[PDB]
Amino acid sequence: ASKWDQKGMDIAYEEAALGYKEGGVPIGGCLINNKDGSVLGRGHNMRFQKGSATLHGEISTLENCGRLEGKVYKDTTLYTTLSPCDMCTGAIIHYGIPRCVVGENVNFKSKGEKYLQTRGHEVVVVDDERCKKIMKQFIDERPQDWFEDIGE
Amino acid sequence: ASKWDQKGMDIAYEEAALGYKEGGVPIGGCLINNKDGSVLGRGHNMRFQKGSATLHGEISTLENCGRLEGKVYKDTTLYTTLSPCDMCTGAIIHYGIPRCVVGENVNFKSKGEKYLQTRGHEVVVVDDERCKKIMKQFIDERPQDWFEDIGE
Ligand SMILES: [Zn+2]
Ligand SMILES: [Zn+2]
Ligand SMILES: [Zn+2]
Ligand SMILES: [Zn+2]
């Protein structure tokens, strides 16, 4: 089940780092087919890049996969550098993506992490230090922007 | 509490009808400030228009409101022509939008409708037959497209 998890989190981290370089929030993701390891799409938070309230890393990832038949999502893993908010949790549930692998849940965690599990989805938190470090750097440099991004 | 609800559902329906005319799925929305009735944004499903897997009517509506401080969402109502999926439910929860007014829940309903309420959001289903009729027309004419849109 975990065969592609290093590949997936490496891509998600690359997306976070790219977003950071663009002036955005360093949250990245990708969607991988569990059978063959192919990458259906990858993305990062586009709040700053696009003035976007909805393009979280996870949402941008799914957008970048394009229109798909519903069946395609059912044997994928969504990789995200940060534990998903209620909206991104809802996307995973809506599309029936069975597995979500999370870089870290230290800098952010919503009720969504547990809700995924109650709705029958697998959540794996890998506690990736690279993810924790880049996210903490953003929180330390741009706390007001982070507060906007979390929507409180 | 319901002062702006006719206005809001009228705008949501206009957005659904516009989307229908553009060749898309007839689901529309708007976000209104509860105090003064001002429209923060309005939108419709953009699957066909933009090849979008994530721009549901509710998501498009929120995107069209732009970047906002989190406090702005806390005294709004989101109007949608159709009862929200788990992703759109999650967006409402994430941003703390206290009220969701729904055109109809006959053509579609998710576990989100009830989840909204247990998470502390008011859900009002007005059973607007304009919404029900246009949505059913789309489902009747384009069942394959509908199936794709709901992620099944
Ligand atoms: Zn997130
Ligand atoms: Zn999110
Ligand atoms: Zn919907
Ligand atoms: Zn939706």
Residue numbers in the entry:
A (entry chain B), B (entry chain A): 7 to 158
Paper passage:
Cytosine deaminases (CD) catalyze the hydrolytic deamination reaction of cytosine to uracil, and are found only in prokaryotes and fungi, but not mammalian cells. Utilization of yeast cytosine deaminase (yCD) to activate the prodrug 5-fluorocytosine (5-FC) to 5-fluorouracil (5-FU) at the target site is an attractive strategy for overcoming the narrow therapeutic index of 5-FU. Structural studies of yCD have shown that its active site contains a tightly bound zinc ion critical for catalytic activity, and is coordinated by His62 and two cysteine residues Cys91 and Cys94, and a hydroxyl group bridged to a second tetrahedrally coordinated zinc bound by three water molecules. Nevertheless, protein delivery of yCD is challenging in part due to its thermal instability.
